Amino acid sequence: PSSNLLEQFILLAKGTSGSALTALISQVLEAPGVYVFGELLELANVQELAEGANAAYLQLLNLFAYGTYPDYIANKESLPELSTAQQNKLKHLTIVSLASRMKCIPYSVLLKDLEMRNLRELEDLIIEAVYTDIIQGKLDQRNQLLEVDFCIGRDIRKKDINNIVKTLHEWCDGCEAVLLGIEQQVLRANQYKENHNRTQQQVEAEVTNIKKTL
Template sequence: MNETNSVLSTNQKLQPFLLLSKSVKGAANAKLIMDALSASGVFVFTELYESPNLVEASTLPEVAPYYKLLSIYLYGTWKDYKQFMSELPALNENQVKKLKILSMATLSESQQTLPYDMLLSELDIPTVRELEDLVIDAFYQGVLTGTLDQRKRQLQVMSSMGRDLRPQQLEETMDILASWSENTTRLLQALDAKIASLQEAVQMNDQAREQYNNEVEQLRRQIHSNNNDKATKPDVGEWDELTRTMDVESGAATPGDERGMRKKGLTGDSPFSDYSSERVKKR
């Protein structure tokens, strides 16, 4: 049985006592309280505690101790009852068991792992066997869910039924929730600022990458263009050699060129020059 079903069940089982509270007057409210505390499966008492006739009767000396006892079942523990036992009515076996089960629910609010030694002390239970029987009964009633670890001697609580709110507990809870909401808002604002900063950094990186790629592409094109120019324009040495050859063919060789041409047999001092003259005379 989960927590929601458990609360619905105990509320349904409380309904007969709420109906009776509308008609019960005066000292009869004391018996009504004791009957509700003994009823099986009833673990939530706020509606009964706030019923108009019971509130009115709580000022009566014969009802006031029972009304105070009812408040302990709302949000108190077995230790609270022991502290004021002399001022409160005596409990029967079922009422003792119920208060101890509710005490375990309260203890589980602050820690999920409840050692056997702590439970034995808090609940005044003499043996481990009696403690385990009580825990199993709490499981069966839907007040607790969890596991018993006999080797480690501890109760591991997975969930527990919510108890009635103590006086001022609602305001305390609202304050805690308000503080949590403020902290959450500040955290979300910090996260939004961090996200905006990261987005700006990403944008700047993208722009820098784009600029870098453009500069690389421009440099690549420039290098390609220079290579094309070198391929179409002759070397300076090749250009001078080509110019001298053209001057020789046109007869405009320079003195320096003639010396070179003599060595190559290209000037008038060549043995072939007379032969050429003779052929011209014959013609």
């Protein structure tokens, strides 16, 4: 029901805004389920807040859409104080970014990037994130690694599109290169078949010539 609630908040944001819109943003960041905030960022009232005097909530939303937990820790003064749900959601987003970048996550990176002093708390947060259908994977405690098979994505509106286009272009170029390579190998196989064929009728021509000779 996260998508339905987010759509309802979008519809409400087309009207009421200001102090109410900040309350809606706080509810979004506190209500579990919403793992994507790109829907809210494109609303014209978010831009209205951008030209509006209030900016702490908008900076918090921008960091939730693009930044990670260390960015919030650095901005602990310029951002509104988070709740337990908001902190857990931001940590989940940071773990999501880490998993998306690299699949097998050592425990050292998790402790460093999330201010995790106790590894038990790290395990609790990891299992909480997995059990809420956010990330799918396996944990290796002997190697102190977090193997993530699948993870959700992050928001993309402003600057990551160029990277996506570059990534898509690289994939398209790579697919074309393999397609051309397969065609070359097929042509080589046909040439080898022709060469094998060419060696054949020469033998029969050699045989038939001797048959005519005798």
